[PDB]
């Protein structure tokens, strides 16, 4: 899995991870992301970055972590 199970188990495409903890303008992937490369390429197509967050729904705010092996 691209995201660790538990707290940061939700893969989201976000503009940036403020202070490396707060995903901004996060959006749920529109295709299955089964590998880090696909995850990253898909988000990139949205001008975003692959982040693993606490919730599968982006309401703004939102605690996130960088997807392992990206950037």
Would you state the CATH architecture of domain 1-71?
A: Alpha-Beta Barrel (3.20)
Q: Give the Cα separation of 59 and 34 in Å (integer).
A: 24
Distances (CA, A) of 25 to 14, 17, 35: 5, 9, 22
What are the domain boundaries of the chain? Answer: 1-71
Cβ-based neighbour number of residue 36 at 10 Å? 17
Q: Give the Cα separation of 31 and 18 in Å (integer).
A: 25
**Structural method:** X-ray
Give the resolution value in Å: 2.2
């Amino acid at each position: 899995a691209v995201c660790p199970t538990g707290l940061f188990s939700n893969p989201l495409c976000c503009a940036t991870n403020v202070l490396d903890l707060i995903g901004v303008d996060c959006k749920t992937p529109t295709i299955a992301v089964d590998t880090g490369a696909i995850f990253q390429a898909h988000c990139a197509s949205k001008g975003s970055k692959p982040l693993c967050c606490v919730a599968p729904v982006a309401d703004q705010a939102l605690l996130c972590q960088k997807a392992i092996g990206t950037f």
